[PDB]
Amino acid sequence: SHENSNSATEGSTINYTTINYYKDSYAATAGKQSAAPLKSPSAEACGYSDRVAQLTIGNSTITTQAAANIIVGYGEWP
Protein backbone atom coordinates (compact mmCIF):
# COMPACT_ATOMS: atom_id res chain seq x y z
CA SER A 1 0.00 0.00 0.00
CA HIS A 2 3.00 2.24 0.65
CA GLU A 3 4.83 1.14 -2.52
CA ASN A 4 4.09 1.18 -6.24
CA SER A 5 3.21 -2.23 -7.68
CA ASN A 6 5.63 -1.70 -10.55
CA SER A 7 8.03 -4.63 -10.61
CA ALA A 8 8.51 -6.87 -13.63
CA THR A 9 6.65 -9.75 -11.96
CA GLU A 10 3.38 -7.95 -11.19
CA GLY A 11 0.36 -9.75 -12.59
CA SER A 12 2.11 -13.12 -12.47
CA THR A 13 0.69 -16.12 -10.61
CA ILE A 14 3.64 -16.46 -8.19
CA ASN A 15 3.95 -14.55 -4.93
CA TYR A 16 7.48 -13.24 -4.43
CA THR A 17 8.56 -12.54 -0.87
CA THR A 18 10.99 -9.64 -1.07
CA ILE A 19 12.70 -6.82 0.80
CA ASN A 20 12.10 -3.22 -0.26
CA TYR A 21 13.12 0.00 1.47
CA TYR A 22 11.94 2.16 -1.45
CA LYS A 23 8.77 3.44 -3.10
CA ASP A 24 8.99 1.14 -6.14
CA SER A 25 8.50 -2.63 -6.24
CA TYR A 26 11.17 -2.98 -8.92
CA ALA A 27 13.72 -1.64 -6.43
CA ALA A 28 13.14 -4.69 -4.21
CA THR A 29 15.33 -7.76 -3.96
CA ALA A 30 15.05 -10.73 -6.29
CA GLY A 31 13.61 -12.63 -3.33
CA LYS A 32 12.10 -16.10 -3.27
CA GLN A 33 9.26 -17.77 -5.16
CA SER A 34 7.30 -18.03 -1.88
CA ALA A 35 2.43 -32.43 -20.13
CA ALA A 36 5.37 -30.04 -19.90
CA PRO A 37 4.85 -27.19 -22.42
CA LEU A 38 8.53 -27.08 -23.41
CA LYS A 39 8.70 -30.82 -24.23
CA SER A 40 6.55 -30.40 -27.39
CA PRO A 41 3.30 -31.72 -25.89
CA SER A 42 0.93 -33.72 -28.05
CA ALA A 43 -2.78 -33.09 -28.52
CA GLU A 44 -3.45 -36.01 -26.16
CA ALA A 45 -0.99 -34.50 -23.68
CA CYS A 46 -2.55 -31.04 -24.05
CA GLY A 47 -6.11 -32.31 -23.57
CA TYR A 48 -7.09 -30.95 -26.99
CA SER A 49 -8.24 -34.15 -28.69
CA ASP A 50 -11.64 -32.57 -29.39
CA ARG A 51 -10.10 -29.94 -31.68
CA VAL A 52 -7.84 -32.39 -33.54
CA ALA A 53 -10.17 -35.34 -34.20
CA GLN A 54 -10.25 -34.35 -37.87
CA LEU A 55 -8.13 -31.37 -38.87
CA THR A 56 -10.41 -29.30 -41.11
CA ILE A 57 -9.51 -25.61 -41.00
CA GLY A 58 -11.49 -23.38 -43.33
CA ASN A 59 -12.31 -25.07 -46.63
CA SER A 60 -9.20 -27.26 -46.27
CA THR A 61 -8.78 -30.75 -44.82
CA ILE A 62 -5.53 -32.59 -44.15
CA THR A 63 -5.72 -36.35 -43.59
CA THR A 64 -3.13 -37.37 -41.00
CA GLN A 65 -2.71 -39.39 -37.83
CA ALA A 66 -4.20 -37.30 -35.05
CA ALA A 67 -3.83 -36.69 -31.31
CA ALA A 68 -0.83 -38.83 -30.36
CA ASN A 69 1.72 -37.64 -32.94
CA ILE A 70 0.30 -34.12 -33.38
CA ILE A 71 2.13 -31.37 -31.49
CA VAL A 72 0.68 -28.23 -29.93
CA GLY A 73 3.36 -25.57 -29.70
CA TYR A 74 4.36 -24.75 -26.10
CA GLY A 75 1.20 -26.42 -24.79
CA GLU A 76 -0.79 -23.40 -25.99
CA TRP A 77 -3.58 -23.50 -28.53
CA PRO A 78 -3.83 -20.37 -30.71
Binding site: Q54, T56, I57, N59, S60, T61
Partner: protein, 42 residues
Protein backbone atom coordinates in the same frame (compact mmCIF):
# COMPACT_ATOMS: atom_id res chain seq x y z
CA UNK B 1 -19.48 -36.14 -45.45
CA UNK B 2 -22.24 -33.66 -44.50
CA UNK B 3 -19.93 -30.67 -45.26
CA UNK B 4 -18.65 -30.59 -41.65
CA UNK B 5 -15.45 -32.65 -41.77
CA UNK B 6 -14.13 -30.85 -44.87
CA UNK B 7 -14.91 -27.12 -44.55
CA UNK B 8 -16.20 -24.64 -42.01
CA UNK B 9 -19.94 -24.22 -42.52
CA UNK B 10 -22.69 -21.78 -41.62
CA UNK B 11 -26.20 -22.80 -40.65
CA UNK B 12 -28.40 -23.25 -43.74
CA UNK B 13 -32.14 -23.81 -43.43
CA UNK B 14 -32.67 -26.30 -46.26
CA UNK B 15 -36.34 -25.85 -47.14
CA UNK B 16 -35.69 -27.92 -50.28
CA UNK B 17 -38.45 -30.42 -50.99
CA UNK B 18 -37.56 -33.92 -52.18
CA UNK B 19 -41.08 -34.58 -53.49
CA UNK B 20 -40.11 -34.11 -57.15
CA UNK B 21 -37.50 -36.91 -57.14
CA UNK B 22 -39.97 -39.61 -56.09
CA UNK B 23 -41.06 -42.36 -58.47
CA UNK B 24 -44.57 -40.87 -58.48
CA UNK B 25 -42.97 -37.62 -59.70
CA UNK B 26 -40.24 -38.95 -62.00
CA UNK B 27 -42.44 -41.60 -63.64
CA UNK B 28 -45.98 -40.16 -63.59
CA UNK B 29 -45.34 -38.33 -66.88
CA UNK B 30 -46.90 -39.75 -70.03
CA UNK B 31 -44.40 -40.78 -72.68
CA UNK B 32 -44.69 -42.26 -76.15
CA UNK B 33 -44.59 -46.05 -75.77
CA UNK B 34 -46.36 -47.05 -78.99
CA UNK B 35 -47.25 -45.81 -82.47
CA UNK B 36 -49.71 -47.74 -84.64
CA UNK B 37 -49.93 -47.13 -88.39
CA UNK B 38 -53.21 -47.79 -90.23
CA UNK B 39 -52.44 -46.55 -93.75
CA UNK B 40 -54.55 -46.70 -96.91
CA UNK B 41 -52.07 -48.26 -99.35
CA UNK B 42 -49.15 -49.35 -97.15
Amino acid sequence: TSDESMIETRCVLNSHSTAETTLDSFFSRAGLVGEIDLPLEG
